[PDB]
Amino acid sequence: IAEREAAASVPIDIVFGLIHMVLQCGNRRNLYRIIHNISANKEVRIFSVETLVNSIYQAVVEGVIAPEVITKRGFEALTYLCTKSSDFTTVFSYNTELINKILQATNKRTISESVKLLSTVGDCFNNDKVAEPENIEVRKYIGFLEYDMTDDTFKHFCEFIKKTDRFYRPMYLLYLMGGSKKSLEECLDKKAEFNSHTHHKGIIKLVRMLSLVNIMGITETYLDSLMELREMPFWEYYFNIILPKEKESLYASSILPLFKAFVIVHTIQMYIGRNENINEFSEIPNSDSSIYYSVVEKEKDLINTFIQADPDLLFHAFAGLQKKILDFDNKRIYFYKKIREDVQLRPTISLMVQRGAVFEDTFHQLMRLNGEQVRNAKFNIKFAGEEGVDAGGLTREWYSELSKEMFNANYALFTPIGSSYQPNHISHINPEHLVYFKFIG
Amino acid sequence: GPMKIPGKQISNTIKQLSNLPEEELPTYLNNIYEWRCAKTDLLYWVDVLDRFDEILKAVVTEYGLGQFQNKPMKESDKEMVYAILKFQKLLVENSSNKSMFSSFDVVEPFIYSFELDLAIEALYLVSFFASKIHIQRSIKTSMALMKMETLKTLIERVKEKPQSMYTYYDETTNNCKRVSIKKAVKKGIYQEIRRFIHAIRLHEMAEQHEKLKIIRMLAFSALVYYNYTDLPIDSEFISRDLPETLAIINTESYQMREAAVTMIDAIFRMRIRHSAVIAAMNAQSHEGMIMNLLKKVVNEDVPEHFAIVFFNFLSSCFASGPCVSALFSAGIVQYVCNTLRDQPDISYRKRMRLVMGANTFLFTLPAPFTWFISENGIRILSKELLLAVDVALGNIKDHDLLMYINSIMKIISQLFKNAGTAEAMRGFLEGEFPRAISLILFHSEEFTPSILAYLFSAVGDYIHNEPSNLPFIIEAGIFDGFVMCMKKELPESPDFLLELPNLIEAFFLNSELIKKIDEENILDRIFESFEIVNLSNIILMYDIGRAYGIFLENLVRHYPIISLTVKEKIYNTMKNLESMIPNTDPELMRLLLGNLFRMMHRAVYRKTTNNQLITDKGLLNNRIISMLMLIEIPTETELYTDVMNILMEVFDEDQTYVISYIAKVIDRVMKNKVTLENIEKIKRILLIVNYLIFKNEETCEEFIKHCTSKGFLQIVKRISQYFDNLKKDTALVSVAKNESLTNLYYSFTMGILKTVYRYSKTNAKEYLKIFGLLVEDLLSKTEQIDHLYYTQRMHGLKNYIMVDKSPQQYPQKNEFVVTQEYLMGINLSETLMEHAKNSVSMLKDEKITMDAHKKVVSSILEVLSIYVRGIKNLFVPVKEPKKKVCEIEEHVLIIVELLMDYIDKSSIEHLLNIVKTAFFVTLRKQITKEMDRENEGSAEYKRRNILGSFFISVFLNLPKEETEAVLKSDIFTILVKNKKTFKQVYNKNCFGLLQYAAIKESRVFSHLVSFIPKMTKQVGASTDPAFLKLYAVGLVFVAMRDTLKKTTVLSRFIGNIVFAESTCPAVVEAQGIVILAIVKLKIEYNLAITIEDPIIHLNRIYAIVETAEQKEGLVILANLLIRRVIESKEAAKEAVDTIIKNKHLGKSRMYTVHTVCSNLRNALFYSISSFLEYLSSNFECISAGWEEIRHKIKIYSGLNAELFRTLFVHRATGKMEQIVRIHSLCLLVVSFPQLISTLVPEDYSFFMYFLENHAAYSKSLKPSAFQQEDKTLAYWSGHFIMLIFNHTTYVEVKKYILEKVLELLPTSINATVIFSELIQEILTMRFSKNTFDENTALVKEMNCLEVMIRSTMQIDNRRKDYGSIMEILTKPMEYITRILAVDEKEAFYEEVTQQSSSEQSEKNEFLKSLCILPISKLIGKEMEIFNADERMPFVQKILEGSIIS
């Protein structure tokens, strides 16, 4: 990942001929390895990447193997090298014009290959080392949204947008806020025959622009512009006229995109800037005449139906939903996704308990550990003497025995109130025994 | 090529295709559209596919195969092959052992034919076959009959008249040009042949273009399954080739979309770029390409080939983890649930296809299973099952309907069997499942046994899960239906048979049900299976026999109430099968028994609880003993293994009952008819008592008292009478059969004698009573009219005497414990003496054959040797008991004296053992050495000396074959110790015998020293290898003796030896051994024997190694002679010092001197003067019986490099000689790397030879018609080069080599491959880090990369071979660029890519065996020729004493 300045193992003249030999060659995986090994020295790495972008450029912008094949193979080599080592991405920060030649060579056929390269290429900007960001011709990139895109090519599109938002936020916002406002005009104009299934690619491109805006956040200037989108008339017409008819005819999958694009607008925040070393500060702006909270609480059942089918919505389009709206099942499912995403080593630690004193034999060992230690442990329960069941049954029986013993008459920690229990009076609870409540926790 | 070593509908279709005339075959093959039958085994269709291979071979040998001369293929021929290829695929799809299909070589030519319809059908068989490579792996050999790489020509994308001229690349001229096919004049002229054929069809047939477009899809799919790696899978393939084919699936005609589905299914099953594959089909979508296509098949009446080929792909999607998750979001689980429960218009086959999909999608991901449970999926299946059962009930079986019931039964039995998906058992009692299950059980006859097998796996698993619901299952009539089911016969279905006991054990949970199972005799189905001939193959093929035994064991241990009826049915079945033995074919009978005993093994004699109830030792004994006397069971079989383990367990329980029973049985058969079959009953009953007695460890007293009893011994006597009666009628029992019978009798009696002797608390007279009776009877027999079986009785008596032996705790302790006085009294030595006089008298009267008489001599000498071994201090003087013992000493001399002339290769072994026992005290060293000397003046000592004189005379009048047996015995160290006897044997030219005896004894060697000056003159032109070996050994041993203060002796040896020409390799080797000895001795000692230059004879060894057999001995000798010429005294001492340094670091105990000496015997023998220097000053931690001692860049001096230059510039003409010569240089480069520096820069020109004959064969590109001689010649030549680069640090020598390697590298593609790999091999073989880093910094200075890169760039040409060559050339230029990318420090740690035909096989395997050996092992190979595998020579003995002193 760091720079490498090695001895030039190959004279620079033959690396051009070597590049064009691997390009006009099938099964070139190990051939790319040699290009990476010779690019260990800075000079050959620079010459190889610029040879690669030059081959891409002259074949499509200017026009044996076909130019379509050689362009697809040129992109295949450029993208492979930027993934391995990534000190090839830093060569794009040295020239910059290399990026503009990749940008110029991006048509309706090339868009798929070109976006995948630029997502990894965007890493040069990361260390705040671009030198001339004003002369990058980024307006070509933001306009790539006109081309048809797969969800995989769109995934790579957001990557370059994330890595360049602190440089082109006002330019990026200008396109996106306009495109979404023009798209929302189009739905409202054809509202008499609007079908979210028929008009799918339209609502997909709309939800794509709205999400892209949320990534960078609004500026104090686009605050007036942001609320115009959050209160577009098509929103009211859809959830009060179209939606009821679409429920009885269309599949839930087709209805979801409008709920996503709608939740995204009211999820968007005003972001100030990168005050921290990497993270950029956020601020929540509020709405007034909008029917957002009204629509979300009216359709709280259909919204939860979408989250049943796809729980990863709470981590993307519906991430800014009020957790109030979530039904217990979805709310609990999301709680488990969020706690488990923080992966930390889980060590199996043995616990020796007696059938009679499951509580004391557990309290004695567990309380020597700390919260972090007890949270990540894979408790291997071993009931003394009695060894006749599986580790999964012992784990359960240990919890089951602890819950029977805590509400114990001899422990006297809790006093019953029918089926439930409450702690015993502070006068009856012993001073040294107060620690037993921390252990129950 | 044909195959190399059933049913009713299957037998009929097989017989029909075998009989039918060739004209009527395609009409019948067409009729078989689908396999609506049980899966067959390819073994049954051998003669069917043999005829199919033959008719296909008749078509390709008539039309052309490669040329396809007759362009118009007749309709009768084309429709015949179309019918064969179509049926073959259907047959192998639904058959077992698919890899057996050996007709693939004749299928291939149809792919490249001008008949579009045939090519498609041939590719469909290859495409399906390739799909099973990852599953069986044995099928790759079946597909190796056709070339898979040639299919890559079909891969090319099809366009509307793209290339009207085919471009071709040719060898020798190396040019590529166009060829116009547009002429269309004649079918002939319009490996490159197959590729050109396709190029013709692409442009010439544009009308039937759709048929060739789908040919590329099948060819692609077959190659995806073969090697997904060497395929054109690019990012461009995913961008356009992937979505183009799935568009065809959704739009093009059924013939086209069927083949496109096959191609998609291959990429899918091989998981190649699988993430993007699922993404291309839009699997997540509610109306996706895959989701909508399912409704297309389910609702429309599409062709069955398309419906099957689609449903097969759909089932493979349900197997993919991420695909099934995407299909789940489309609503696949919601579709299958609604389609089955709501839509009843669907066919029984399509309904079953939907259930079949769920049988996979419910087990791949947990998420769809939880959704199935929430959608009440089990209730949907139960409702549908009850409906389907009711329909079939009472009506003629509908195959489709029964298959639907079978799929519902599979899905439920499998859901219940799967632990994780046990949630399916929730709505069981509520649902229609118990109702349909009882209905099936009541009318079992109306359904498949495979349905009834799933029925048990569902009912049983449900009962076992929650046994609290068993009353509800009984209440639903499920147990009553099961009993009704058990009234019907057993089916030939292993699934039914194996699942039956599991349901019985699950029914046994209710105590009321056990009374019904016992009452209704339902357990009879479990036992009767063992006696049904038809089931026997199935019980064997599956582990049904073993499974039933485990079941009986578990059923009896958990519920011992059935123990009575289980024990009753076990021993009843044992008797029923025993009854079949007489009226059954032995091959089948042994199969039935093997299955029964595989059950018996697991059911009886288990250490488990309640098992004692079903195990009756008496019942088991009577049946096992009876069975053994009716059928002959071979030891090799597992039946014998199981039978004898149970018989051993019965014998262990009551040893006495088993023997008294077989004693009553054996004499009962003797009273019966004396027939040949009754003979085998008595033979087999003795062979079983012999196994029981030999395998018995602890023996009880009552068994021993039964053996010594008059009742048992009287029966034994009647056996000897019955057996000797058989010797009267020679027509009935042949002499050979009677000899075998006699040998069985004596083995039987010897066995009972052995157990009585071994048994503790055994009286001396109790053993002597049996010994007495048995020996006295044996001795009376050898005094009858019938002398024909004399050798058989004498062999028996030898083993009788052998029983009385000491327990053998002291090394070689063999004397008579009790029988000494008995045998002395009965005058065994005196009768043996009379036996020798009588037999030799018959030879005077010419009443016995000379060959026959020598066999009698062997018999008398064999018995005598064993008798005299047990006599205490025989030929040892002691005044008190020298009365009768002395008489035996004289008997030995008389016996030997009589039969001295009549000894042979057979008798000489016994004569040696008699002499070995006569000289025992001197031989095994019992004497005090000084006492042994004073003993010499004895009657006993003088008697043994005359026996030695008989033995020497006997040995000297025997030829090379006879003597070889006892050429190196320990008796000669005593016999030849007398100077007079030593000269007697030397004059009789038996130099071998003397060599071995001298190596061991100093006194014997003392006499050999005296001959060395005399025999020095005969060494030149000797022709006797043993004589040359004796001389060379005598010289080196006398040099080592001189090291231990002798010195003056080896100086006195003066002479001149000039060796004569020899065409014999045995003589040439022995001549070389003499040179090797003289040469190496002149290194550290002063030897005055002057010989001709060792190179004169070394060259002879190189020339003779090509023609001679057993070449190893010559290569070792020549290489050791080269080493001993070049190696200095300083280098030889340092080689020995280094060998001892390895056993110094270990700092272990190493207690004795003898251990250090015999372990380092090779080092000892290399230079004993150097070996003694190391131990004396650098003393080790050797105890030696007195506490312990204190302990703690190859630059050699004085090497003779003239031989290295000589051998380096030799150049042999012969193929073999060159390999050995280059191998020799490889050893020198390793042993003394300083020899390279001796080469003058002019001598660098001779290196070219090694590079040239290494480039002759490319190791990577394996060429055709290569010879293994050429391959190892190329290898060792290149190996010599890389050994120079790794074992030396001579920069200018390496710089010259690399210069010539780089000059040769771009001369040809062959040279580019072999040299780029050679330059890589110099680095990949990393001898040292400093040597590797020297070669690493040198190749970058030399610009090696620039040379191989430019070479590969120039050889770039559009040729299908280029892709193969690139995968080869990139490997060395990747490794080399990688080392030069990483710093010098981490460069080393970098790894790569991070009887004439019977004699030809002997010489080729020798070329593989030649290798560089470690110096420790190489020095050992030298010691092997002088020491001759003797663990201790006399030189080692005197050395040990010097070390301690």
- The total number of residues shown for chain B amounts to 1445
Residues 6+ apart with CB under 8 A from B146: B104, B105, B107, B108, B126
CB within 8 Å: B329 and A14: no
CA–CA min distance A223, chain B (Å): 37
Task: Identify residue B882 by its one-letter amino acid code.
Answer: K
For residue B66, what is the DSSP state?
A: T
Number of alpha carbons in the 13 Å side-chain half-sphere of residue B178: 6
Instruction: Return the axis-axis angle of helices B1065-1084 and B1025-1041, rounded to nearest 10°.
Output: 10
Q: How far apart are CA B367 and CA B325, in angstroms?
A: 8
Q: Which residues in chain A are contacts of B1378 at CB distance < 8 A?
A: 33, 37
Give B239's Cβ-side CA count (13 Å radius).
19
DSSP state letter for A349:
E
In whole angstroms, what is the distance from residue B1404 CA to residue B899 CA? 50
DSSP B165: B
Q: DSSP state, B1056?
A: E
Q: Which residues contact B1036 (CB under 8 A, 6 or more apart)?
A: B1077, B1080, B1081, B1426
What tokens were used for A394? 């012992």
Phi (first) and psi of residue B137, to 5 degrees = 75, -20
Residue B407 and residue B377 in contact, taking contact as beta carbons nearer than 8 Å:
no
CB-CB neighbors (< 8 A) of A68 in chain B: 236
CA B518 to chain centre: 49
Q: How far apart are CA B1209 and CA B1203, in angstroms?
A: 10
- Give me the DSSP letters along B1090-1136: EE--HHHHHHHHHHHHHHSSS-HHHHHHHHHHHHHHH--HHHHHHHH
User: B1015, B1102, B1119: which is closest to B1057 by C-alpha?
Assistant: B1015
Alpha-carbon dihedral B1324, B1330, B1336, B1339, rounded to 10 degrees? -110
Token pair, residue B586, equals 């032995």
Pairing of strands B176-177, B168-169: antiparallel
What gap in Å lies between CA B910 and CA B915, rounded to an integer? Answer: 9
Beta bridge partner(s), residue A414:
A423
d(Cα B916, Cα B922) in Å, to the nearest integer? Answer: 9
Asked whether B1360 and B1419 are in contact (CB, 8 A), the reply is no
How far apart CA B1234 and CA B1196 sit, in angstroms, is 8
B1234: enclosing H helix or E strand: none
Residues of B in contact with A69 (CB under 8 A): 236
> Which among B276, B1340, B1353 has the least Cβ separation from residue A21?
B1353
Q: B962: how many CB neighbours lie within 10 A of its CB?
A: 17
Burial state string for B497-523 with b = 16 or more CB within 10 A and e = fewer than 16: bbbbbbbbbbbbebeebbebbeeeebb
- CA distances (Å), origin B491, targets A147, B408, B526, B1420: 66, 21, 12, 69
d(CA B1153, CA B1146): 16
**CA distances to B195, B795, B1367 from B1364, in Å:** 17, 70, 5
From chain B, the residues in CB contact with A21 under 8 A are: 1352-1353, 1356
Torsion over CA: B201, B206, B208, B213 (sign): positive
Q: Name every residue in A having a CB less than 8 A away from some CB of B.
A: 4, 6-7, 9-11, 14, 17-18, 21, 25-27, 30-31, 33-34, 37-38, 40, 68-69, 72-73, 75-76, 112-113, 150-152, 251, 253-254, 309-310
Asked if residues B666 and B711 have their Cβ atoms less than 8 Å apart, the reply is no
User: Between chains, do B235 and A75 touch, taking CB under 8 Å as contact?
Assistant: yes
Query: Tokens 């605050």 appear where?
Result: A223
Q: In chain B, after which residues does the backbone break, taking C–N over 2.5 angstroms as a break?
A: 5, 190, 1192, 1394
Among the partner residues B236, B276, B1349, nearest to A69 by beta-carbon distance? B236
Q: What is the dihedral of CA A381, A387, A389, A395, to 10 degrees?
A: -10
Q: Which of B687, B715, B693 is nearest to B628 (CA)?
A: B687
Q: Pairing relation of β-strands B95-96 and B40-41?
A: parallel
- Give me the sign of the Cα torsion angle B28, B30, B36, B42: positive
Q: Take residue B82 and report the two structure tokens written for it.
A: 């179309």
Two structure tokens written together for A136: 């990058």
Token code pair at residue B253: 């005609």
Say yes or no for a CB contact (<8 Å) between B279 and A9: no
Rounded-to-integer distance, Cα A317 and Cα A284, Å: 16
Q: Give the β-pairing of A414-417 and A378-383.
A: unpaired
What does the block give as tokens for B810? Answer: 């002291």
Token pair for B635: 């030891």
Quote the minimal CA–CA distance from B51 to chain A in Å: 43
Cβ–Cβ under 8 Å, residues B457 and B416: yes
Nearest Cβ partner for A7 among B285, B286, B1340 = B1340
Distance CA B79, CA B74 (A): 8
DSSP state at residue A280: -
Residues of A in contact with B1382 (CB under 8 A): 40
β-pair type (B1088-1091, B95-96): unpaired
Q: Do the Cβ atoms of B372 and B418 come closer than 8 Å?
A: no
Distance from C-alpha of B1044 to C-alpha of A184, rounded to nearest angstrom: 112
Q: What is the 3-state secondary structure (H, E, C) of B824-890?
A: HHCCHHHHHHHHHHHHHHHHHCCCCCHHHHHHHHHHHHHHHHHHHHCCCCCCCCCCCCCCCHHHHHH
Burial of B99 (0-12, 13-18, 19+ CB in 10 A): middle
Contacts with A236 (C-beta within 8 Å, 6 or more apart), sequence order:
A291
Other Cβ atoms within 10 Å of A227 Cβ, number: 17
Q: Closest by alpha carbon to A22, among A9, A4, A34? A: A34
Cβ within 8 Å, pair B1377-A37: yes
B1336: nearest Cα among B1382, B1402, B1292, B1400: B1382
- B790 by DSSP, 3-state: which? helix
User: What b/e sequence results for A28-38 when a residue is b if at least 16 CB atoms lie within 10 Å of its CB, and e otherwise?
Assistant: bebbbbbbbbb
Q: Does B157 lie at the interface with A, CB-CB under 8 angstroms?
A: no
Determined by X-ray
Query: What tokens were used for B1102?
Result: 């190189």
Question: Identity (one letter) of the amino acid at B1388?
Answer: F
Nearest to B1381 among A6, A30, A31 (CB): A6
In whole angstroms, what separates CA B813 from the centre of its chain?
41
Select from B235, B287, B1353 the Cβ nearest to the Cβ of A18: B1353
A-chain residues within 8 Å CB-CB of B1340?
Answer: 7, 9
Which residues in chain A are closer than 8 Å to B1350, comparing Cβ atoms?
A: 14
Cα–Cα nearest to A15, from A39, B263, B134, B516: A39
Q: Could you report how far apart the first and last alpha carbons of chain A are, in Å?
A: 45
User: For A27, which DSSP code?
Assistant: S
B7 CB neighbour count, 10 Å cutoff: 13
CB contact under 8 A, B1371 and A34: no
Name residues whose C-beta falls within 8 Å of residue B1425's C-beta, 6 or more positions apart in sequence. Answer: B1029, B1073, B1076, B1117
Across the interface, do A31 and B1366 touch by the CB < 8 Å criterion?
yes
Nearest Cα neighbor of B132 from B84, B96, B88, B86 is: B96
Instruction: Report the SS3 class of residue B40.
Output: strand
CA dist., res. B1038 & res. B1434, Å (int)? 11
Contact pairs from chain A to chain B, CB under 8 Å? 86
Give Cα separations from B905 to B376, B893, B960, B967 (angstroms).
89, 20, 10, 12
d(C-alpha B976, C-alpha B998), whole Å: 9
Q: Do A9 and B1340 touch (CB under 8 A)?
A: yes
How far apart CA B446 and CA B484 sit, in angstroms, is 13
Whole-number Cα distances in Å, B1191 to B427, B526, B1145, B1159, B1161:
84, 75, 11, 19, 21
Residue listed under structure tokens 């064009």: A20
* End-to-end C-alpha distance for chain B, whole angstroms: 78
Chain B hits for A113, CB-CB cut-off 8 Å, are 235, 239
User: DSSP alpha helices (H): ranges in A266-390?
Assistant: 292-298, 300-309, 328-340, 358-366, 371-376
> Is B419 within 8 Å of chain A by CB?
no
d(CA B925, CA B454): 78
Closest Cα in chain A to B371: A309
Residues just before a chain gap in chain A (C–N exceeding 2.5 Å) are 63
How many CA within 13 A on the CB side of residue A245? Answer: 12
| Resolution of this entry, Å | 3.0
Tell me which residue of B333, B341, B443 sits closest to B387, measured CA to CA.
B341
Q: B1370 and A112: CB-CB below 8 Å?
A: no
Contact B1353 A14 (CB under 8 A): yes
- Do residues B225 and B267 touch, judged by C-beta distance below 8 A? no
H/E stretch holding B1238: none
CB contact under 8 Å between B1374 and A251, yes or no, is no
Chain B neighbors of A309, CB-CB under 8 A? 329
DSSP label at residue B180: B
Enter the tokens of residue B1259: 């190791």
The answer to whether B63 and B74 are in contact (CB under 8 A) is no
Give me the helix-helix angle, A13-23 and A67-83, nearest 10°.
110
Residues in a beta bridge with B176: B169
Residue B1349 has φ and ψ, to the nearest 5°, of: -65, -50
The answer, for B1378 touching chain A at a CB cutoff of 8 Å, is yes
Closest approach of A183 to chain B, Cα-based (Å): 24
Q: What gap in Å lies between CA B406 and CA B417, rounded to an integer?
A: 16
> Two tokens at A220?
């104090």
Any A CB within 8 A of B232 CB = yes
* Cβ neighbours of B449 (radius 10 Å): 17
Q: Do A30 and B1371 touch (CB under 8 A)?
A: yes
User: Is residue B719 a contact partner of residue B668, using CB atoms and an 8 Å limit?
Assistant: no
Alpha carbon distance B336, B34 (integer Å): 26
* φ/ψ of residue B158, rounded to 5: -85, 125
Give start and end residues of each alpha helix (H) in B695-734: 701-707, 710-725
Alpha-carbon distance of B764 to A347, in angstroms, equals 71
**To 10 degrees, what angle do helices A29-38 and A67-83 make?**
60
How long is chain A? 441
How far is A116 from chain B, CA to nearest CA, in Å? Answer: 12
**d(C-alpha B1337, C-alpha B1320), whole Å:** 13
Q: Do B1353 and A17 touch (CB under 8 A)?
A: yes
User: Of the candidates B1345, B1370, B1380, which has its C-beta nearest A30's C-beta?
Assistant: B1370
Contacts (Cβ under 8 Å, ≥6 apart) of B612: none
State how far residue B312 is from chain A, nearest Cα, in angstroms: 28
- The span from the CA of B198 to the CA of B204, in Å, is 10
Torsions phi, psi for B1088 (to 5 deg): -85, 10
